[PDB]
Design a protein around this ligand. Sequence first.
Ligand SMILES: NC(=O)C[C@@H]1NC(=O)C2(CCCCC2)NC(=O)C[C@@H](c2ccc(CC(=O)O)cc2)/C=C/C[C@@H](Cc2cccc3ccccc23)CNC1=O
Ligand SMILES: NC(=O)C[C@@H]1NC(=O)C2(CCCCC2)NC(=O)C[C@@H](c2ccc(CC(=O)O)cc2)/C=C/C[C@@H](Cc2cccc3ccccc23)CNC1=O
Ligand SMILES: NC(=O)C[C@@H]1NC(=O)C2(CCCCC2)NC(=O)C[C@@H](c2ccc(CC(=O)O)cc2)/C=C\C[C@@H](Cc2cccc3ccccc23)CNC1=O
Lengths: 90, 95, 94
Amino acid sequence: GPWFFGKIPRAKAEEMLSKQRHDGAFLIRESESAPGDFSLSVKFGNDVQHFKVLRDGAGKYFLWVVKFNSLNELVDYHRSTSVSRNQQIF
Amino acid sequence: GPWFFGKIPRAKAEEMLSKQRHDGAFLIRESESAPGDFSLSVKFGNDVQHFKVLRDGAGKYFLWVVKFNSLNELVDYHRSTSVSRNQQIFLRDIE
Amino acid sequence: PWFFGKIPRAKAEEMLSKQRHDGAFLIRESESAPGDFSLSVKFGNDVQHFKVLRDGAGKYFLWVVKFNSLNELVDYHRSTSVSRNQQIFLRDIE
Ligand SMILES: NC(=O)C[C@@H]1NC(=O)C2(CCCCC2)NC(=O)C[C@@H](c2ccc(CC(=O)O)cc2)/C=C/C[C@@H](Cc2cccc3ccccc23)CNC1=O
Ligand SMILES: NC(=O)C[C@@H]1NC(=O)C2(CCCCC2)NC(=O)C[C@@H](c2ccc(CC(=O)O)cc2)/C=C/C[C@@H](Cc2cccc3ccccc23)CNC1=O
Ligand SMILES: NC(=O)C[C@@H]1NC(=O)C2(CCCCC2)NC(=O)C[C@@H](c2ccc(CC(=O)O)cc2)/C=C\C[C@@H](Cc2cccc3ccccc23)CNC1=O
């Protein structure tokens, strides 16, 4: 369904996710403190892992190395490439 | 150039604006309320015009039609394309 | 509400230094590294600068105590001094 939840509190995001049935359900939340600081929360097993969406000096987004111009591109790329140094897909 | 943030009491923020030498001078206001919406406060003459920063389901930012991947990109774009659909206003930094 | 804009360092510090209360502050965001922050804090006629440090878990801190967000760090230092020798508490500009 939707994956962007705006400035939803970390704890509420984890409550949402933690209840999901499937390994790979995710959301992106935006920091209330830092405009355009995004986090990706992903359910896996009994935990919910959290990845900061990094920005480079041109404002591109990335998790580790590869850069994306938009959150949508990052999400779609990580539908087939793992977000973790562990096998984590959507 | 760097961005500076601070909790100006809104009235003082508006006083600071419009006293700038350029109409295009602007600030970004961050909503106190739950969504945390963003707005642009832009000087024009002695008044301050307000532009809502709208968001879609992919997290993009926009004012009218064209969408932007960051607030920074929106600002930089409107340094060269007018922010208003009537009067020609171009965003400028605080002087 | 929070207002941010592109104020030149020198003008920002001039405005700050002119504030009536020690501890009045602004947050500066890096030009090079989006979301890299420092705190500019009035103390007398000076402006002290505290880098917002980040660790390997993404926590925010200035000295020893670590916080989960920039907001938590700032609010904590509204009631606990940012300086060890000087009693300096963050407050909004007026
Ligand atoms: N992005 C825009 O604002 C463009 C456009 N501009 C305006 O209306 C003018 C003023 C400046 C000159 C140009 C017209 N803005 C306004 O009068 C007020 C402006 C404003 C500014 C700040 C704040 C404070 C804050 O939210 O924190 C609130 C509201 C209102 C914007 C609402 C918008 C109607 C609307 C509402 C909800 C969802 C929408 C989705 C898609 C389209 C429109 C939607 C009408 N408004 C324009 O569509
Ligand atoms: N969080 C802290 O700052 C704690 C401590 N700060 C200080 O002692 C005081 C300030 C109060 C009075 C004098 C001492 N800080 C400073 O003088 C400089 C203060 C500053 C802040 C912002 C501006 C403006 C701007 O960059 O745009 C300029 C300078 C930060 C200094 C950096 C810090 C060391 C550091 C940090 C991050 C990564 C590092 C990687 C490798 C090595 C060192 C690293 C040293 N400094 C303190 O760790
Ligand atoms: N993009 C990435 O996160 C890659 C990588 N992430 C991780 O290793 C794992 C999560 C999965 C299981 C354990 C490892 N995340 C973390 O440790 C912390 C994780 C996180 C996510 C969301 C929340 C808040 C919430 O909950 O909203 C808090 C923390 C992200 C990042 C912190 C990062 C260090 C760092 C800090 C600042 C600037 C940096 C610039 C360049 C490189 C690193 C920087 C270390 N961490 C990873 O660089």
